[PDB]
Every structure is written in structure tokens, then in C-alpha cells.
Amino acid sequence: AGSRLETVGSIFSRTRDLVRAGVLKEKPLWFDVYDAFPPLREPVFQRPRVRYGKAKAPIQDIW
Amino acid sequence: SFFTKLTADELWKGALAETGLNRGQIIGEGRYGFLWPGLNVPLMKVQTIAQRSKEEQEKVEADMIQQREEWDRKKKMKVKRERGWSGNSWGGISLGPPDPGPCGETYEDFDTRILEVRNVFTMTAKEGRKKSIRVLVAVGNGKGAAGFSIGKATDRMDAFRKAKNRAVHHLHYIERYEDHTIFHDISLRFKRTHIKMKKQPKGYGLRCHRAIITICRLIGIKDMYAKVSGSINMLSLTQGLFRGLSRQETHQQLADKKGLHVVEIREECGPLPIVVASPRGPLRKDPEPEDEVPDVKLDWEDVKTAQGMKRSVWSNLKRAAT
Amino acid sequence: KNRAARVRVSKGDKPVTYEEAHAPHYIAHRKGWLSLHTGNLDGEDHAAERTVEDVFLRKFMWGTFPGCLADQLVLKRRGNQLEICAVVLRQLSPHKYYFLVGYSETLLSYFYKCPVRLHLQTVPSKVVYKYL
Amino acid sequence: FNDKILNEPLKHSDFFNVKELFSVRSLFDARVHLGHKAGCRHRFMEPYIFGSRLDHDIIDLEQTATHLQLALNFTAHMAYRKGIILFISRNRQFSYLIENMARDCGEYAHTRYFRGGMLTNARLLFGPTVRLPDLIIFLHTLNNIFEPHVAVRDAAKMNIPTVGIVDTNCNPCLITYPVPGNDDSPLAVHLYCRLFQTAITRAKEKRQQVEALYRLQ
RNA sequence: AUAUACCGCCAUCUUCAGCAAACCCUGAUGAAGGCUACAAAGUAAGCGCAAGUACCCACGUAAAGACGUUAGGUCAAGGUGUAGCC
Numbered sequence: 001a002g003s004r005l006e007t008v009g010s011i012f013s014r015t016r017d018l019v020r021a022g023v024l025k026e027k028p029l030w031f032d033v034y035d036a037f038p039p040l041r042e043p044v045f046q047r048p049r050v051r052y053g054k055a056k057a058p059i060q061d062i063w
Numbered sequence: 064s065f066f067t068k069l070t071a072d073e074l075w076k077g078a079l080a081e082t083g084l085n086r087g088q089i090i091g092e093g094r095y096g097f098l099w100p101g102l103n104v105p106l107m108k109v110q111t112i113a114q115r116s117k118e119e120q121e122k123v124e125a126d127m128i129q130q131r132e133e134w135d136r137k138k139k140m141k142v143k144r145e146r147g148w149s150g151n152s153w154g155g156i157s158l159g160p161p162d163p164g165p166c167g168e169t170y171e172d173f174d175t176r177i178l179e180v181r182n183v184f185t186m187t188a189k190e191g192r193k194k195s196i197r198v199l200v201a202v203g204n205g206k207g208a209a210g211f212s213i214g215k216a217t218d219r220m221d222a223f224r225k226a227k228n229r230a231v232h233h234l235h236y237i238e239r240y241e242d243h244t245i246f247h248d249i250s251l252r253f254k255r256t257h258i259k260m261k262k263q264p265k266g267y268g269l270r271c272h273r274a275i276i277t278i279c280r281l282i283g284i285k286d287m288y289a290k291v292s293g294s295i296n297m298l299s300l301t302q303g304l305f306r307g308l309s310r311q312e313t314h315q316q317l318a319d320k321k322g323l324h325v326v327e328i329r330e331e332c333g334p335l336p337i338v339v340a341s342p343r344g345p346l347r348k349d350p351e352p353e354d355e356v357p358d359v360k361l362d363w364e365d366v367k368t369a370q371g372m373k374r375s376v377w378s379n380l381k382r383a384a385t
Numbered sequence: 386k387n388r389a390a391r392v393r394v395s396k397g398d399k400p401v402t403y404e405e406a407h408a409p410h411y412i413a414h415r416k417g418w419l420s421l422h423t424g425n426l427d428g429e430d431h432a433a434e435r436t437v438e439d440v441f442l443r444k445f446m447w448g449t450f451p452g453c454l455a456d457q458l459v460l461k462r463r464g465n466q467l468e469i470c471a472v473v474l475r476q477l478s479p480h481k482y483y484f485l486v487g488y489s490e491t492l493l494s495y496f497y498k499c500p501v502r503l504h505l506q507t508v509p510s511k512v513v514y515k516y517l
Numbered sequence: 518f519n520d521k522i523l524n525e526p527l528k529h530s531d532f533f534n535v536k537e538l539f540s541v542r543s544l545f546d547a548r549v550h551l552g553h554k555a556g557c558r559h560r561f562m563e564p565y566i567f568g569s570r571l572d573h574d575i576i577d578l579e580q581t582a583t584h585l586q587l588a589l590n591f592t593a594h595m596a597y598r599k600g601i602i603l604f605i606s607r608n609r610q611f612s613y614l615i616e617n618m619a620r621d622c623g624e625y626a627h628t629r630y631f632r633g634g635m636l637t638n639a640r641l642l643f644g645p646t647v648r649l650p651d652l653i654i655f656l657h658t659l660n661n662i663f664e665p666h667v668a669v670r671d672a673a674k675m676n677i678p679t680v681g682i683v684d685t686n687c688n689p690c691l692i693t694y695p696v697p698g699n700d701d702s703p704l705a706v707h708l709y710c711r712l713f714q715t716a717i718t719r720a721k722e723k724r725q726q727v728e729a730l731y732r733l734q
Numbered sequence: 735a736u737a738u739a740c741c742g743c744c745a746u747c748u749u750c751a752g753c754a755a756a757c758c759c760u761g762a763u764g765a766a767g768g769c770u771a772c773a774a775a776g777u778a779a780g781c782g783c784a785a786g787u788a789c790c791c792a793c794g795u796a797a798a799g800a801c802g803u804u805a806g807g808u809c810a811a812g813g814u815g816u817a818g819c820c
């Protein structure tokens with residue numbers, strides 16, 4: 001089948017879940033490697049909201 | 064004359080007026096009683112050119128009358144069409160299971176139900192009113208996974224298959240506390256439409272809006288109270304239904320976001336504190352700060368029901384069984 | 386819009402034949418004349434009846450082969466001899482087709498007083514040229 | 518049933534020993550730490566900023582090494598799993614290199630104008646049965662107009678994991694394995710085409726090793 | 735009797751270049767929209783222009799001109815729906 005909602009969850013959160021409901025009759029081949037070495041961030045889409053009030057970037061200046 | 068007679072295709076073209084019969088007549092029958100050894104007989108064996116009688120012909124000509132009439136009564140049959148939400152309205156009309164792909168990839172568990180049809184128009188340059196039909200389906204097989212998408216084309220039959228073959232590619236996995244319900248009482252708004260959707264115990268029946276009955280029967284959620292307020296526009300209802308059914312915290316997540324064991328108390332049971340989920344890993348030795356009467360901005364329509372002051376003659380109705 | 390012999394394109398679900406998929410300014414360019422007699426030359430007689438002999442056969446054979454006469458007829462004439470090339474369908478039993486060959490070859494021959502000689506060609510389906 | 522060479526190297530950690538092929542000293546002299554100005558610094562990249570020395574954003578190389586080791590681990594397992602690997606780039610400066618890189622390895626590239634819907638309309642724009650490329654490597658996630666490249670949104674939709682070289686302009690939300698690094702300087706990409714080629718060429722010959730081992734067994 | 739039921743044959747824009755099935759994407763999955771070669775989402779069978787063909791050439795004039803627009807015109811070319819007269 002497939003699920004091409006890039007917003008409602010990351011591609012691991014869909015491919016783990018579409019094989020828990022059993023609609024996919026075969027897993028993708030990259031699936032076990034994410035199940036072995038996941039990245040440090042969950043790659044879900046977030047809208048870029050923009051800084052408005054007294055909320056600057058928390059970076060520092062190098063001196 | 065003879066040459067004024069013409070073919071059959073130029074007859075139905077002139078009589079049907081779609082620009083703004085020959086199944087029983089075998090080649091061997093004739094009105095005058097007649098047989099030929101080529102056809103209408105035992106083939107090549109009666110082998111003499113001979114004719115019939117008159118009242119035998121009155122037996123087979125009356126047969127043709129009953130064949131056409133019975134075939135016409137077969138044309139005049141009322142199809143036992145399933146009633147979806149009303150007669151003469153493509154409401155909860157079930158289509159078949161959606162179409163298989165170009166290599167394999169069957170979808171035999173899925174079901175498709177229509178949600179809203181709309182004869183939509185747009186004034187174009189040449190033709191004027193361009194009527195297109197804008198249909199909306201939902202896929203789902205029970206089993207926690209479902210989806211929905213829209214179709215838009217210039218014909219009824221061709222717009223349905225557009226929406227079916229789209230929605231099997233756009234799927235959510237609606238998680239469930241064990242099958243029949245959801246996790247927490249969720250209340251959201253999709254652009255105008257405040258939907259309050261609360262968790263219910265078993266046997267309650269789907270006391271929820273006419274669309275949401277025929278969506279959760281495709282997800283497997285068997286009973287849930289869902290009062291939709293504000294605007295009820297069918298596509299904006301469903302895209303609000305589907306996010307808050309997906310933006311959903313399982314009991315193993317409620318632990319693992321906070322640590323601590325999640326306990327549940329059932330009123331029909333005793334005080335038996337059944338753990339539904341312990342965290343996968345550590346355990347926190349800090350009990351929760353039990354600040355009573357917290358600032359959870361609760362609704363108003365739950366307080367008037369929990370007080371029981373107000374009433375409606377359609378508040379609690381003995382309706383049918385889903 | 387001239388609408389002489391042009392089948393109109395509406396969808397891609399009407400199977401058209403090669404003789405029907407050409408507009409009638411293609412009769413020398415991409416087609417030929419379905420009939421063949423020496424009438425319309427300059428200047429030779431017996432053209433006046435020889436079309437009435439021509440239009441009768443395309444209204445006769447479409448009756449006696451109903452639903453199985455695939456394309457238009459090829460009505461030739463060679464002196465006191467005329468052949469009928471004809472494509473048919475492979476649906477009816479060949480005991481009935483030969484009965485129609487032997488019947489029509491002696492019916493019109495006594496009607497127009499000339500040896501009519503029908504010769505058949507079978508194609509199982511319709512030879513689709515375009516799917517419009 | 519030969520899943521015994523497939524089930525093994527997920528239990529292992531760094532089965533290819535890819536960590537010998539890159540170091541923080543070796544990364545710095547490819548000038549991977551350099552970035553764009555502090556105006557166009559993307560809001561989702563501020564975790565991966567060391568600081569702003571004189572309106573110039575430097576990248577935490579201690580955060581790259583814990584990403585590049587996890588990124589080069591992914592592409593090495595997948596070329597070992599005979600997966601199909603692409604390279605998408607649109608910089609026009611390294612369109613010769615990342616193509617000539619792909620001819621050196623056994624993997625494919627697409628370094629020009631992305632036709633709209635190449636992954637999502639794949640069964641029509643190509644033949645009716647096509648094996649979709651089950652890994653995508655970005656070397657410039659921006660177009661020639663500094664918009665996110667369209668394959669960052671289609672590879673999410675067509676459900677194939679993508680790695681990328683995400684700079685201070687771009688959005689790392691849809692790249693399933695971000696590597697925060699410089700990409701517009703040629704000494705960066707000369708090392709960036711170095712590490713993504715060595716890790717998959719070792720991955721090919723490691724696959725041919727273990728298969729004859731169990732075929733000799 | 736009805737071209738305000740139609741086939742059949744055409745007029746007009748047409749001295750046009752468009753129309754399009756089927757898929758994909760974008761609009762929070764709203765009516766709809768889908769242009770950027772130092773290229774940001776489109777792909778496209780199919781039709782028409784074009785191209786070929788006739789005439790004295792490759793020029794030219796013909797022929798060709800889709801989908802639609804005007805309930806265009808014709809029951810009085812022929813056929814024929816409905817209603818009528820017999």
C-alpha cells in the first residue's frame with residue numbers, strides 16, 4: 001500500500017506501524033537497520049515557526 | 064423503397080438523442096413456416112427443403128412473445144441496493160474492495176465507504192458551467208489502520224476509482240486501547256470545527272456523528288462519544304477526526320514520557336489497581352506531585368451533564384443498533 | 386465542422402477500423418474506392434445503373450450476414466464477372482456460412498444475369514486501427 | 518534461506534570499522550565547519566551551531582562525528598544489503614564529480630533538473646515495475662534557488678530513508694540521517710565524495726567475502 | 735405538428751492552437767491550480783495545428799481545422815422520436 005503522509009509521523013513511525021497492522025505483506029529492506037542504528041533525532045516534519053517577541057536564538061558568539 | 068431502409072446504428076443514434084434489440088432473431092427463423100438444411104434444422108441430416116404447418120407456427124410465434132416479455136421483465140427489476148444514510152443519497156454507500164496494483168498488492172481486507180458527494184461547478188471559457196463531481200471516501204480494514212482521500216473528475220463512476228486508489232496510499236495507524244476504543248478524551252479544532260471526543264467503555268455503541276459511525280467501523284473503534292460543534296463540513300470534519308485519532312498517547316507512551324507506572328481503576332471492578340503499562344527500562348523513585356484541583360481548562364458541556372441541570376429532547380435517544 | 390464520414394473522438398473506448406478512421410478527403414491519398422467498375426470515366430456509359438447495382442449489394446449482404454459482416458464490402462467487376470471480397474466474423478458455424486455462400490452466389494447471379502463469385506476472408510475480431 | 522549473513526551485522530556495532538576512515542582532524546582540514554552568514558541560519562539548525570564568529574556560523578564537529586559515524590554506518594549496511602543508492606545534487610559545481618563518483622562505485626546518480634514526480638509517479642514515468650532506490654544521498658539539499666530540494670519531500674512520501682549534507686540554510690526535518698556540514702566549498706565535497714564512496718566500496722567486497730564463506734560451508 | 739426529441743449534412747468563431755483520457759503534486763487534502771533550461775512539479779497516450787498529399791516546386795492556393803459557442807439551419811432531401819388525421 002504505502003503511506004505518504006510526511007507530516008503525521010516520520011517514515012519509521014509509519015513503517016513500524018503499517019507492519020503492526022499487517023497491511024504491508026513484506027517489510028522494506030532498510031527497516032532493520034533503523035531497528036539497529038537509529039539516528040539521534042526523530043526526523044518528523046515540524047513547521048518552521050518564527051521568533052517574535054523576547055525570544056532570540058540561544059546560540060553564543062565566539063570570542 | 065428498399066434503399067430508404069438503412070442500418071441499425073443510424074436508428075438508435077436518431078432515437079436516443081444523446082447529442083444535445085437484435086438478440087433473439089437467429090438467422091434461420093422466418094415468419095412463413097420454413098426450414099432449410101443449412102440452419103434451423105438438424106445440420107445436414109432434415110435434408111429436404113420443406114415448410115411447417117400453420118398452428119405449429121402459432122405455437123412457436125407465441126413462444127417469441129413470452130421470451131421477449133420475460134427478458135423485458137428481467138430488464139424491469141429493482142436492484143436491491145443497500146441504503147447508505149438515506150435513499151437516493153451516496154452517504155454510507157459501500158463500494159467494493161479497492162483495486163489491485165500493477166504488480167500484485169491486493170487490498171482484500173479493506174472497505175471503502177462514501178462520505179460526501181457534490182456536483183461542483185466552475186464557469187469555463189468556452190463551455191460555461193463545467194460540472195465536476197467531488198467525491199470523498201475512506202479506506203480501512205478494521206485492524207487499527209485507515210485513511211481517506213478525495214476524488215474529482217467529470218463523471219460519477221470515474222471519480223470513485225480515483226478516490227479509492229488514492230486513499231490506500233494515504234494511511235494512518237489509529238492506535239487503540241484494546242480494540243473497541245481510544246486512549247484519552249481528546250478535544251480539538253480543525254479550523255472551525257470544535258470536536259469533543261471522549262473515551263467510553265464497552266457495549267456503549269457508536270453514539271457519534273453519522274460520518275464518524277461509518278469511519279470508526281472501518282477502523283474498528285466500536286463505541287465512542289463524539290459531539291461535533293461549530294461548522295459541520297464533511298471534509299473538514301474528517302481531517303479533524305483523523306489527526307486527533309493519530310495524535311494519541313498510548314499507555315506505554317504515557318509511562319515513558321513520565322517514567323511512572325500507569326494504573327487504572329474500574330468501577331465495575333473493585334479497587335484492583337491493574338497496571339496497563341510499566342516503562343520500558345528505568346523506574347523513577349519520585350512519586351508525582353499530587354497538586355489537587357489543577358488548571359486543566361475543562362469544557363462547559365461536560366459540567367452541565369455532570370450536574371444534570373440541563374436537558375434536551377434529543378440528549379439521550381433510544382436509537383437503533385449502529 | 387464538416388461531418389461527412391468522420392467518426393468523432395469522444396473517448397478512447399470506441400474501436401475504429403482503417404476504412405472508418407480516415408476522413409473522406411483521403412480517398413486517393415490513404416484509401417481507395419471500395420467498389421470497382423468502369424462507370425465514372427470520361428466518357429463511358431452504364432454508370433447510371435451500375436451504382437444502383439452497387440448500393441443494393443451493400444444493403445443485401447448486411448442483412449443475410451447479420452452481426453457478422455465486419456467491414457465494408459469490396460465489390461469488383463471484371464467484364465461479365467464480378468467478385469465479392471468480404472471480411473466476416475469467426476463466430477457463426479461454418480456449416481451456416483457455406484450455406485450462405487452457395488445461396489447468395491446463385492441468387493444475385495440470376496438477379497443481375499452475370500456470374501457473381503463471392504470469396505470470403507475470416508478475421509476473428511475487429512481489426513482496430515485507432516483507439517480514439 | 519541465507520539470512521545468517523543478513524542477521525549478523527546488526528548485532529555487531531560498526532561491522533565495517535568505518536570509524537578508521539574519518540577523524541575530527543581529518544574533517545576540519547576539509548573545512549566542513551564553515552557555514553553561511555548568521556542571517557540565513559535556519560531555525561532547525563541551531564542545535565548544530567558552535568557559534569557565530571564575526572557573522573559566520575561554525576558547526577560543532579563533535580556533533581558531526583557522532584552523526585557522520587551514524588550516517589556512514591547506515592549507507593555501509595545498505596550497500597552491503599545490495600540496496601539501490603542514489604546521489605541527488607543541484608549545485609552545478611560538482612555535477613561532474615558526484616556523477617564521476619557514482620561511476621567509480623556501483624551506485625547511481627541524478628545530478629540535474631529533477632522532473633516533477635520522478636519518485637511518486639515512478640510506475641508511469643518508467644516501466645510498470647521498477648525497484649525504487651532504497652537510499653538517497655543528498656550533497657546539496659538546496660536547489661539552484663535556495664528552497665529545500667523537492668526530493669526531501671518525495672523521499673519522505675515514497676518512504677525511503679534519505680541522508681544529506683545539511684548546511685545552515687536548510688531544513689533537516691525530513692532528512693532521516695542529517696550530517697551537519699559545509700557543502701558549498703570544494704574541499705568539503707572532495708572529502709564528502711570520499712567517505713561516501715569508500716564506505717560502500719568496502720561494503721561491496723565484504724558482501725562477496727561472507728557469501729563464499731557460507732557457500733564453502 | 736415539433737430541428738426546443740434526433741440521426742443524417744453543414745454554417746460561425748476557425749485568417750484559432752488548442753482539447754484531452756489516465757496518474758502525480760500543490761493548496762492545513764476547499765472551489766481549483768501545476769509557468770521558470772545557469773530551471774522552483776509536473777508526466778502524458780489520444781485528437782487538432784503541424785508534417786505529408788493534390789495542383790505547375792520545397793512557394794502558393796486548395797484541401798484540412800479537434801473540443802466547444804449560438805436549443806445556428808434543415809421533419810420540406812431521406813430516415814425517424816413523440817403527439818395527431820385516418
Ligand SMILES: [Mg+2]
Binds near residue numbers: 149150151
Ligand atoms: Mg428514498
Ligand SMILES: [Mg+2]
Binds near residue numbers: 386
Ligand atoms: Mg467549411
Ligand SMILES: [Mg+2]
Ligand atoms: Mg477553404
Ligand SMILES: [Mg+2]
Binds near residue numbers: 798
Ligand atoms: Mg494540415
Ligand SMILES: [Mg+2]
Binds near residue numbers: 805
Ligand atoms: Mg433552433
Ligand SMILES: [Zn+2]
Binds near residue numbers: 699
Ligand atoms: Zn550551503
